[PDB]
Amino acid sequence: MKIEDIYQFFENPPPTYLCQEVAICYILYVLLQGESYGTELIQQLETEHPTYRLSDTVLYSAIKFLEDNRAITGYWKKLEGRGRPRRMYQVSPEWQHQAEDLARLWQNYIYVRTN
Amino acid sequence: MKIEDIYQFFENPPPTYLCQEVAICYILYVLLQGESYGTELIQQLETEHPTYRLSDTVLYSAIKFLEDNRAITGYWKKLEGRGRPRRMYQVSPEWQHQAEDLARLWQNYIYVRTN
């Protein structure tokens, strides 16, 4: 690291990487609107909220948590115009209401931090 | 983890662990006040700013940076009543001005995120 990197850190703050607790709520917030997959969950976040990021590590730690708890289901889908199938996630019916509650936490979290 | 941990994250935000860039400025801020040592640098942060923490890993990543750049000097101090010596740090004489500039970054950083 260089001394200039210190100044840069304060001048141009790096993006905030979601921790697992927040990522879980963000993921459920998205899945409640419709099925999505890993790469899209990450891309959608940084495209709409440029000062935010979701790492592969946190993403799949969150997915593991959700699948271990039977909160979501996954299935492989062949997307149009793409050769590589993607594993689509959907909220399990049993978690619909609980998921809505967690999704609210993300909606409020991002709103308060950007307004 | 557990669902309750998710709710806890939002209801009772966990303290912020300093990243290297910020820790470097915080450490210089303290050293400008007088010589200090690792354990004190960590404890003093929590005491002065209860919503912040400094990990042992970031502390010594910061110390490495400072020593590599000759911004601080280290030496062994014998304490009365204790067998194990203590490793003390002091800002290097010629780094006075630069350390003060970096210290200001810390003060502003902590001011905006705490006041």
Side-chain angles (χ1 to χ4, degrees):
Chain A
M1 183 185 283
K2 298 75 168 56
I3 183 177
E4 182 47 46
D5 296 313
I6 302 172
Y7 282 107
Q8 284 301 316
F9 178 89
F10 293 100
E11 296 184 299
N12 303 301
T16 297
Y17 276 75
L18 303 187
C19 70
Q20 189 175 317
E21 294 93 324
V22 181
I24 288 167
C25 299
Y26 162 68
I27 291 166
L28 288 173
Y29 167 82
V30 174
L31 299 185
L32 282 172
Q33 300 175 67
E35 58 173 25
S36 190
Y37 50 99
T39 57
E40 182 174 77
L41 284 161
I42 287 173
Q43 190 55 68
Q44 186 175 318
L45 173 67
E46 64 184 72
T47 290
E48 179 167 26
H49 301 289
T51 61
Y52 286 81
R53 297 283 187 282
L54 172 55
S55 70
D56 272 312
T57 290
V58 175
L59 166 65
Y60 296 122
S61 285
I63 289 296
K64 173 177 185 294
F65 170 85
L66 291 171
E67 290 201 68
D68 283 351
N69 283 281
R70 301 172 178 171
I72 59 176
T73 58
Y75 79 89
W76 290 97
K77 179 183 179 68
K78 294 181 264 57
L79 304 181
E80 293 186 61
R82 300 193 70 59
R84 184 200 193 291
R86 297 292 182 171
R87 186 164 163 56
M88 309 313 293
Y89 306 110
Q90 293 173 299
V91 179
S92 61
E94 194 178 314
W95 278 69
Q96 182 66 38
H97 302 304
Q98 176 61 271
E100 169 66 10
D101 292 353
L102 299 175
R104 263 65 167 268
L105 296 177
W106 161 258
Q107 192 171 303
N108 181 266
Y109 175 86
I110 196 58
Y111 172 76
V112 180
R113 292 169 64 88
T114 61
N115 295 276
Chain B
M1 53 168 68
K2 194 63 188 296
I3 298 295
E4 180 57 20
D5 296 312
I6 298 174
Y7 282 101
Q8 285 305 311
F9 179 83
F10 294 97
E11 309 183 311
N12 295 137
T16 302
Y17 274 73
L18 307 186
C19 60
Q20 193 179 314
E21 297 91 328
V22 178
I24 289 170
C25 298
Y26 160 65
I27 291 167
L28 288 173
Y29 163 74
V30 174
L31 294 187
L32 284 166
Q33 298 176 39
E35 61 170 24
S36 191
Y37 52 106
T39 69
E40 185 175 68
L41 286 164
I42 293 175
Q43 190 55 56
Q44 190 174 313
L45 177 62
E46 189 181 315
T47 300
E48 285 181 50
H49 303 290
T51 62
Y52 289 86
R53 295 287 185 288
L54 175 57
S55 76
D56 187 68
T57 293
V58 175
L59 164 62
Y60 289 102
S61 291
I63 290 295
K64 175 175 194 313
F65 174 84
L66 292 171
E67 292 218 37
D68 285 346
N69 283 280
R70 316 297 183 182
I72 65 173
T73 58
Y75 80 90
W76 289 105
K77 183 178 184 182
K78 182 56 179 295
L79 305 181
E80 190 178 6
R82 200 183 85 174
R84 184 191 188 296
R86 173 174 282 170
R87 189 67 175 169
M88 305 293 302
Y89 298 97
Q90 297 192 334
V91 180
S92 294
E94 284 304 294
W95 267 75
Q96 199 97 293
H97 185 68
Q98 177 67 77
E100 297 172 323
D101 291 325
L102 295 178
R104 278 188 273 283
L105 296 182
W106 160 251
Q107 301 185 66
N108 288 302
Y109 174 84
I110 194 67
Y111 178 73
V112 183
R113 292 168 55 68
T114 310
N115 194 299

Short mmCIF file of all heavy atoms in Angstrom, two decimals, chain A residues 1-3 5-7 9-10 19-22 24-25 65 69 95 98 101-102 105-106 109, chain B residues 1-3 5-7 9-10 19-22 24-25 65 69 95 98 101-102 105-106 109:
data_model
loop_
_atom_site.label_atom_id
_atom_site.label_comp_id
_atom_site.label_asym_id
_atom_site.label_seq_id
_atom_site.Cartn_x
_atom_site.Cartn_y
_atom_site.Cartn_z
N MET A 1 0.84 -1.23 0.00
CA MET A 1 0.00 0.00 0.00
C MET A 1 0.86 1.26 0.00
O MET A 1 1.93 1.29 0.60
CB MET A 1 -0.91 0.01 1.23
CG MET A 1 -1.86 1.20 1.28
SD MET A 1 -2.82 1.24 2.81
CE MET A 1 -4.05 -0.01 2.47
N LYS A 2 0.39 2.29 -0.69
CA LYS A 2 1.11 3.56 -0.76
C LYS A 2 0.37 4.62 0.05
O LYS A 2 -0.83 4.49 0.29
CB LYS A 2 1.23 4.04 -2.21
CG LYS A 2 2.00 3.13 -3.16
CD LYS A 2 1.19 1.91 -3.56
CE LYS A 2 1.86 1.17 -4.72
NZ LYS A 2 3.26 0.78 -4.39
N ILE A 3 1.08 5.67 0.44
CA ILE A 3 0.47 6.75 1.21
C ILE A 3 -0.66 7.40 0.41
O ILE A 3 -1.64 7.87 0.97
CB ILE A 3 1.52 7.82 1.58
CG1 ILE A 3 0.87 8.90 2.44
CG2 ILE A 3 2.11 8.43 0.32
CD1 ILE A 3 1.84 9.96 2.92
N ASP A 5 -2.72 5.91 -1.46
CA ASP A 5 -3.90 5.06 -1.37
C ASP A 5 -4.72 5.45 -0.16
O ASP A 5 -5.94 5.27 -0.15
CB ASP A 5 -3.51 3.59 -1.28
CG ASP A 5 -2.80 3.09 -2.52
OD1 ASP A 5 -3.30 3.37 -3.64
OD2 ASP A 5 -1.76 2.42 -2.38
N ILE A 6 -4.06 5.96 0.87
CA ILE A 6 -4.77 6.36 2.07
C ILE A 6 -5.64 7.57 1.74
O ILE A 6 -6.82 7.60 2.08
CB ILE A 6 -3.79 6.73 3.21
CG1 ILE A 6 -2.90 5.53 3.51
CG2 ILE A 6 -4.57 7.14 4.45
CD1 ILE A 6 -1.77 5.83 4.49
N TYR A 7 -5.06 8.55 1.08
CA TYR A 7 -5.80 9.75 0.70
C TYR A 7 -6.95 9.39 -0.23
O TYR A 7 -8.06 9.91 -0.09
CB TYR A 7 -4.87 10.75 0.02
CG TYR A 7 -4.02 11.52 1.01
CD1 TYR A 7 -2.66 11.26 1.13
CD2 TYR A 7 -4.59 12.49 1.83
CE1 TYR A 7 -1.88 11.95 2.06
CE2 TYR A 7 -3.82 13.19 2.76
CZ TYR A 7 -2.47 12.91 2.87
OH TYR A 7 -1.71 13.60 3.78
N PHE A 9 -8.61 6.65 -0.39
CA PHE A 9 -9.66 5.99 0.37
C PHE A 9 -10.69 6.98 0.88
O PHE A 9 -11.90 6.71 0.85
CB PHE A 9 -9.07 5.22 1.56
CG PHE A 9 -10.11 4.55 2.40
CD1 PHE A 9 -10.53 3.26 2.11
CD2 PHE A 9 -10.71 5.23 3.45
CE1 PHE A 9 -11.54 2.66 2.86
CE2 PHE A 9 -11.72 4.64 4.21
CZ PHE A 9 -12.14 3.35 3.91
N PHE A 10 -10.21 8.12 1.37
CA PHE A 10 -11.09 9.15 1.91
C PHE A 10 -11.66 10.04 0.81
O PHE A 10 -12.79 10.51 0.91
CB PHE A 10 -10.32 9.99 2.92
CG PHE A 10 -9.95 9.24 4.17
CD1 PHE A 10 -8.67 8.73 4.33
CD2 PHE A 10 -10.89 9.00 5.16
CE1 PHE A 10 -8.33 8.00 5.46
CE2 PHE A 10 -10.57 8.26 6.30
CZ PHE A 10 -9.28 7.76 6.45
N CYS A 19 -22.56 -7.67 4.06
CA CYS A 19 -22.26 -8.81 4.92
C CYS A 19 -23.33 -9.89 4.79
O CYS A 19 -24.36 -9.53 4.13
CB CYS A 19 -22.17 -8.36 6.38
SG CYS A 19 -23.74 -7.86 7.11
N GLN A 20 -23.16 -11.05 5.27
CA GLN A 20 -24.15 -12.10 5.07
C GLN A 20 -25.57 -11.78 5.52
O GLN A 20 -26.52 -12.09 4.80
CB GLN A 20 -23.69 -13.39 5.76
CG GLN A 20 -24.57 -14.58 5.42
CD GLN A 20 -24.05 -15.87 6.00
OE1 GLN A 20 -22.85 -16.14 5.96
NE2 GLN A 20 -24.95 -16.68 6.53
N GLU A 21 -25.73 -11.17 6.69
CA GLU A 21 -27.06 -10.83 7.19
C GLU A 21 -27.82 -9.95 6.21
O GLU A 21 -29.00 -10.19 5.92
CB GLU A 21 -26.97 -10.14 8.56
CG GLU A 21 -26.45 -11.05 9.66
CD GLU A 21 -24.94 -10.94 9.86
OE1 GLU A 21 -24.20 -10.77 8.87
OE2 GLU A 21 -24.50 -11.06 11.02
N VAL A 22 -27.15 -8.92 5.70
CA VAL A 22 -27.77 -8.00 4.76
C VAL A 22 -28.00 -8.67 3.41
O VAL A 22 -29.06 -8.49 2.80
CB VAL A 22 -26.91 -6.73 4.56
CG1 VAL A 22 -27.60 -5.78 3.58
CG2 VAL A 22 -26.69 -6.04 5.89
N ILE A 24 -28.61 -11.72 2.79
CA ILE A 24 -29.75 -12.63 2.85
C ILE A 24 -31.04 -11.86 2.59
O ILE A 24 -31.89 -12.31 1.83
CB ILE A 24 -29.80 -13.34 4.23
CG1 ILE A 24 -28.67 -14.37 4.31
CG2 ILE A 24 -31.16 -14.02 4.45
CD1 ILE A 24 -28.43 -14.91 5.70
N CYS A 25 -31.18 -10.69 3.21
CA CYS A 25 -32.37 -9.87 3.03
C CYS A 25 -32.48 -9.32 1.61
O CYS A 25 -33.58 -9.28 1.04
CB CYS A 25 -32.40 -8.74 4.06
SG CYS A 25 -32.45 -9.35 5.77
N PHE A 65 -27.15 -20.74 3.36
CA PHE A 65 -28.00 -20.52 4.53
C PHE A 65 -29.46 -20.72 4.14
O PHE A 65 -30.20 -21.46 4.80
CB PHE A 65 -27.81 -19.11 5.08
CG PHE A 65 -28.82 -18.74 6.13
CD1 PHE A 65 -28.62 -19.09 7.47
CD2 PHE A 65 -29.99 -18.09 5.78
CE1 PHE A 65 -29.58 -18.79 8.43
CE2 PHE A 65 -30.96 -17.78 6.73
CZ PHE A 65 -30.75 -18.13 8.06
N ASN A 69 -31.90 -23.94 5.23
CA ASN A 69 -33.11 -23.65 5.99
C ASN A 69 -34.38 -23.86 5.18
O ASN A 69 -35.48 -23.54 5.64
CB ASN A 69 -33.06 -22.22 6.53
CG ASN A 69 -32.14 -22.09 7.74
OD1 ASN A 69 -32.52 -22.45 8.86
ND2 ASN A 69 -30.93 -21.59 7.52
N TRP A 95 -41.86 -20.14 3.25
CA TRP A 95 -41.12 -18.96 3.69
C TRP A 95 -41.60 -17.65 3.11
O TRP A 95 -41.00 -16.61 3.33
CB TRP A 95 -39.63 -19.12 3.37
CG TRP A 95 -38.89 -19.93 4.37
CD1 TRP A 95 -39.01 -21.27 4.60
CD2 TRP A 95 -37.88 -19.46 5.26
NE1 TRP A 95 -38.13 -21.66 5.58
CE2 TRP A 95 -37.43 -20.57 6.00
CE3 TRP A 95 -37.32 -18.20 5.51
CZ2 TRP A 95 -36.42 -20.46 6.98
CZ3 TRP A 95 -36.32 -18.09 6.48
CH2 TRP A 95 -35.89 -19.21 7.19
N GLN A 98 -42.21 -14.95 5.93
CA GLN A 98 -40.98 -14.66 6.64
C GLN A 98 -40.06 -13.89 5.69
O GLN A 98 -39.41 -12.93 6.08
CB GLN A 98 -40.30 -15.96 7.07
CG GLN A 98 -38.95 -15.78 7.75
CD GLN A 98 -39.04 -14.97 9.02
OE1 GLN A 98 -38.93 -13.75 9.01
NE2 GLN A 98 -39.25 -15.66 10.14
N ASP A 101 -40.86 -10.24 5.40
CA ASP A 101 -40.37 -9.50 6.56
C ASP A 101 -38.88 -9.17 6.43
O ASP A 101 -38.44 -8.06 6.75
CB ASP A 101 -40.59 -10.30 7.85
CG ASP A 101 -42.05 -10.43 8.21
OD1 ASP A 101 -42.91 -9.78 7.56
OD2 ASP A 101 -42.35 -11.17 9.17
N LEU A 102 -38.09 -10.15 5.97
CA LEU A 102 -36.66 -9.92 5.83
C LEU A 102 -36.38 -8.97 4.67
O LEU A 102 -35.49 -8.12 4.77
CB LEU A 102 -35.92 -11.25 5.62
CG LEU A 102 -36.06 -12.23 6.79
CD1 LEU A 102 -35.39 -13.55 6.43
CD2 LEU A 102 -35.44 -11.65 8.05
N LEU A 105 -36.35 -5.41 5.63
CA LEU A 105 -35.14 -4.95 6.29
C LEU A 105 -34.16 -4.40 5.26
O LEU A 105 -33.54 -3.37 5.50
CB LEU A 105 -34.50 -6.08 7.09
CG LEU A 105 -35.35 -6.61 8.26
CD1 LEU A 105 -34.62 -7.78 8.92
CD2 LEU A 105 -35.62 -5.50 9.27
N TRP A 106 -34.03 -5.07 4.12
CA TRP A 106 -33.13 -4.58 3.08
C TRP A 106 -33.67 -3.30 2.47
O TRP A 106 -32.93 -2.33 2.29
CB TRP A 106 -32.94 -5.61 1.96
CG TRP A 106 -32.42 -4.99 0.68
CD1 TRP A 106 -33.14 -4.69 -0.44
CD2 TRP A 106 -31.08 -4.52 0.44
NE1 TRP A 106 -32.34 -4.06 -1.36
CE2 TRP A 106 -31.08 -3.94 -0.85
CE3 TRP A 106 -29.90 -4.53 1.18
CZ2 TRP A 106 -29.93 -3.38 -1.42
CZ3 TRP A 106 -28.75 -3.96 0.62
CH2 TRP A 106 -28.78 -3.39 -0.67
N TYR A 109 -32.92 -0.60 4.84
CA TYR A 109 -31.48 -0.43 4.97
C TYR A 109 -30.89 0.43 3.86
O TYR A 109 -30.19 1.41 4.12
CB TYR A 109 -30.82 -1.81 4.95
CG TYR A 109 -29.30 -1.82 4.97
CD1 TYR A 109 -28.60 -1.76 6.17
CD2 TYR A 109 -28.58 -1.97 3.78
CE1 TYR A 109 -27.20 -1.86 6.19
CE2 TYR A 109 -27.19 -2.07 3.79
CZ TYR A 109 -26.51 -2.03 5.00
OH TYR A 109 -25.14 -2.20 5.01
N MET B 1 -25.62 -19.32 10.52
CA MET B 1 -26.21 -18.38 11.52
C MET B 1 -27.69 -18.67 11.75
O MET B 1 -28.21 -19.69 11.30
CB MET B 1 -26.03 -16.94 11.05
CG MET B 1 -26.55 -16.67 9.64
SD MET B 1 -26.63 -14.90 9.28
CE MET B 1 -24.91 -14.46 9.24
N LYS B 2 -28.36 -17.77 12.45
CA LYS B 2 -29.78 -17.94 12.73
C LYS B 2 -30.57 -16.70 12.32
O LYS B 2 -30.01 -15.60 12.20
CB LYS B 2 -30.00 -18.23 14.22
CG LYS B 2 -31.39 -18.75 14.54
CD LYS B 2 -31.66 -20.08 13.85
CE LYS B 2 -33.11 -20.53 14.00
NZ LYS B 2 -33.51 -20.79 15.41
N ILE B 3 -31.87 -16.87 12.11
CA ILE B 3 -32.74 -15.77 11.71
C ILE B 3 -32.68 -14.60 12.69
O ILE B 3 -32.69 -13.45 12.27
CB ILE B 3 -34.21 -16.24 11.58
CG1 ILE B 3 -34.32 -17.32 10.50
CG2 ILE B 3 -35.11 -15.06 11.24
CD1 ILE B 3 -33.99 -16.83 9.10
N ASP B 5 -30.24 -13.57 14.35
CA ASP B 5 -29.00 -12.82 14.15
C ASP B 5 -29.19 -11.78 13.06
O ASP B 5 -28.55 -10.72 13.07
CB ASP B 5 -27.86 -13.76 13.75
CG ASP B 5 -27.52 -14.76 14.83
OD1 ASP B 5 -27.37 -14.33 16.00
OD2 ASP B 5 -27.40 -15.96 14.52
N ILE B 6 -30.05 -12.09 12.10
CA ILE B 6 -30.32 -11.16 11.01
C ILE B 6 -31.07 -9.96 11.58
O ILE B 6 -30.72 -8.81 11.32
CB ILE B 6 -31.16 -11.83 9.90
CG1 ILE B 6 -30.36 -13.00 9.31
CG2 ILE B 6 -31.50 -10.82 8.81
CD1 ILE B 6 -31.13 -13.83 8.31
N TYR B 7 -32.10 -10.22 12.38
CA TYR B 7 -32.85 -9.13 12.98
C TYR B 7 -31.93 -8.31 13.88
O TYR B 7 -32.00 -7.08 13.89
CB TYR B 7 -34.01 -9.68 13.80
CG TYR B 7 -35.19 -10.09 12.95
CD1 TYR B 7 -35.42 -11.43 12.64
CD2 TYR B 7 -36.08 -9.14 12.46
CE1 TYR B 7 -36.50 -11.82 11.86
CE2 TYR B 7 -37.17 -9.52 11.67
CZ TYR B 7 -37.37 -10.86 11.38
OH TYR B 7 -38.45 -11.25 10.62
N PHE B 9 -28.75 -7.72 13.60
CA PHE B 9 -27.85 -6.89 12.82
C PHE B 9 -28.46 -5.51 12.53
O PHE B 9 -27.77 -4.50 12.57
CB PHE B 9 -27.50 -7.56 11.50
CG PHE B 9 -26.60 -6.75 10.63
CD1 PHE B 9 -25.22 -6.77 10.83
CD2 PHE B 9 -27.12 -5.92 9.64
CE1 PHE B 9 -24.38 -5.98 10.06
CE2 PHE B 9 -26.28 -5.12 8.87
CZ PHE B 9 -24.91 -5.15 9.08
N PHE B 10 -29.75 -5.49 12.24
CA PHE B 10 -30.43 -4.24 11.92
C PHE B 10 -30.88 -3.45 13.15
O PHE B 10 -30.79 -2.23 13.18
CB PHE B 10 -31.65 -4.53 11.03
CG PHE B 10 -31.28 -5.06 9.68
CD1 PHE B 10 -31.30 -6.43 9.43
CD2 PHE B 10 -30.89 -4.20 8.65
CE1 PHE B 10 -30.93 -6.93 8.18
CE2 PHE B 10 -30.52 -4.69 7.41
CZ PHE B 10 -30.54 -6.06 7.17
N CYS B 19 -10.65 -0.54 8.55
CA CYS B 19 -9.90 -1.18 7.48
C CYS B 19 -8.50 -0.59 7.64
O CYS B 19 -8.32 0.34 8.42
CB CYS B 19 -10.48 -0.83 6.11
SG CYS B 19 -10.49 0.93 5.70
N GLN B 20 -7.53 -1.13 6.91
CA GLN B 20 -6.15 -0.67 7.02
C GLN B 20 -5.93 0.83 6.84
O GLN B 20 -5.25 1.46 7.65
CB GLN B 20 -5.26 -1.43 6.03
CG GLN B 20 -3.77 -1.25 6.29
CD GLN B 20 -2.91 -2.02 5.31
OE1 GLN B 20 -3.17 -3.20 5.04
NE2 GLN B 20 -1.89 -1.37 4.76
N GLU B 21 -6.51 1.40 5.79
CA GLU B 21 -6.33 2.82 5.52
C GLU B 21 -6.76 3.70 6.69
O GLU B 21 -6.07 4.65 7.05
CB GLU B 21 -7.10 3.22 4.26
CG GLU B 21 -6.60 2.53 2.99
CD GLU B 21 -7.30 1.21 2.69
OE1 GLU B 21 -7.71 0.50 3.63
OE2 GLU B 21 -7.43 0.89 1.49
N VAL B 22 -7.91 3.37 7.29
CA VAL B 22 -8.42 4.14 8.42
C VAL B 22 -7.60 3.87 9.68
O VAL B 22 -7.28 4.79 10.43
CB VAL B 22 -9.90 3.81 8.69
CG1 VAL B 22 -10.40 4.59 9.90
CG2 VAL B 22 -10.74 4.15 7.45
N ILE B 24 -4.50 3.12 9.93
CA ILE B 24 -3.21 3.81 9.84
C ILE B 24 -3.35 5.24 10.36
O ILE B 24 -2.52 5.71 11.13
CB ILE B 24 -2.71 3.83 8.38
CG1 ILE B 24 -2.27 2.42 7.96
CG2 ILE B 24 -1.57 4.83 8.23
CD1 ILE B 24 -1.97 2.30 6.46
N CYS B 25 -4.41 5.93 9.94
CA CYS B 25 -4.63 7.30 10.37
C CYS B 25 -4.97 7.37 11.87
O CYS B 25 -4.49 8.26 12.57
CB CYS B 25 -5.76 7.93 9.55
SG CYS B 25 -5.37 8.02 7.79
N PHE B 65 2.82 -1.28 7.58
CA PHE B 65 2.85 -0.16 6.65
C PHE B 65 3.67 0.99 7.23
O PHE B 65 4.56 1.53 6.57
CB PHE B 65 1.44 0.35 6.37
CG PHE B 65 1.41 1.60 5.53
CD1 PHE B 65 1.47 1.52 4.15
CD2 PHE B 65 1.36 2.85 6.14
CE1 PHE B 65 1.49 2.68 3.37
CE2 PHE B 65 1.38 4.01 5.37
CZ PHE B 65 1.44 3.93 3.98
N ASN B 69 7.44 2.26 5.95
CA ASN B 69 7.60 3.61 5.45
C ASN B 69 8.40 4.52 6.39
O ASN B 69 8.56 5.71 6.13
CB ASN B 69 6.23 4.21 5.16
CG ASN B 69 5.63 3.69 3.87
OD1 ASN B 69 5.99 4.15 2.79
ND2 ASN B 69 4.74 2.71 3.98
N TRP B 95 8.32 12.66 10.45
CA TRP B 95 6.98 12.36 9.95
C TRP B 95 5.90 13.15 10.68
O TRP B 95 4.71 12.93 10.47
CB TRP B 95 6.67 10.87 10.08
CG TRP B 95 7.01 10.07 8.87
CD1 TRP B 95 8.25 9.71 8.45
CD2 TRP B 95 6.09 9.55 7.90
NE1 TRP B 95 8.17 9.00 7.28
CE2 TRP B 95 6.85 8.88 6.92
CE3 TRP B 95 4.69 9.59 7.77
CZ2 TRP B 95 6.27 8.25 5.81
CZ3 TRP B 95 4.11 8.95 6.66
CH2 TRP B 95 4.90 8.29 5.70
N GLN B 98 3.36 15.00 8.24
CA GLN B 98 2.55 14.05 7.49
C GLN B 98 1.60 13.28 8.40
O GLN B 98 0.45 13.04 8.05
CB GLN B 98 3.44 13.06 6.74
CG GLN B 98 2.65 11.99 5.99
CD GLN B 98 1.85 12.56 4.84
OE1 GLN B 98 2.39 12.86 3.77
NE2 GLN B 98 0.54 12.72 5.04
N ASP B 101 -1.37 15.32 9.12
CA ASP B 101 -2.31 15.40 8.00
C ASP B 101 -3.18 14.15 7.97
O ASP B 101 -4.39 14.22 7.76
CB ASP B 101 -1.56 15.53 6.66
CG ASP B 101 -0.87 16.87 6.50
OD1 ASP B 101 -1.40 17.90 6.97
OD2 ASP B 101 0.22 16.91 5.88
N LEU B 102 -2.55 12.99 8.18
CA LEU B 102 -3.29 11.73 8.18
C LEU B 102 -4.20 11.64 9.40
O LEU B 102 -5.30 11.09 9.33
CB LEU B 102 -2.31 10.55 8.16
CG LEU B 102 -1.48 10.46 6.87
CD1 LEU B 102 -0.51 9.31 6.96
CD2 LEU B 102 -2.41 10.28 5.68
N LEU B 105 -7.46 13.19 8.82
CA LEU B 105 -8.37 12.36 8.03
C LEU B 105 -9.18 11.47 8.98
O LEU B 105 -10.37 11.25 8.78
CB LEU B 105 -7.60 11.51 7.03
CG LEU B 105 -6.84 12.27 5.94
CD1 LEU B 105 -6.16 11.29 4.99
CD2 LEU B 105 -7.82 13.17 5.17
N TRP B 106 -8.52 10.97 10.02
CA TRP B 106 -9.19 10.13 11.00
C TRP B 106 -10.23 10.94 11.76
O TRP B 106 -11.39 10.53 11.88
CB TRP B 106 -8.17 9.54 11.99
CG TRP B 106 -8.80 9.07 13.28
CD1 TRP B 106 -8.67 9.66 14.51
CD2 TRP B 106 -9.68 7.96 13.45
NE1 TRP B 106 -9.43 8.97 15.44
CE2 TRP B 106 -10.05 7.93 14.81
CE3 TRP B 106 -10.19 6.98 12.58
CZ2 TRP B 106 -10.92 6.96 15.33
CZ3 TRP B 106 -11.05 6.02 13.10
CH2 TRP B 106 -11.41 6.01 14.46
N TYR B 109 -13.14 11.63 9.61
CA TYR B 109 -13.81 10.36 9.34
C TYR B 109 -14.71 9.95 10.50
O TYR B 109 -15.86 9.54 10.30
CB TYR B 109 -12.76 9.28 9.12
CG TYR B 109 -13.31 7.88 8.96
CD1 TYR B 109 -13.77 7.42 7.73
CD2 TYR B 109 -13.35 7.00 10.04
CE1 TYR B 109 -14.25 6.12 7.57
CE2 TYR B 109 -13.83 5.70 9.90
CZ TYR B 109 -14.27 5.27 8.66
OH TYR B 109 -14.71 3.97 8.52
#
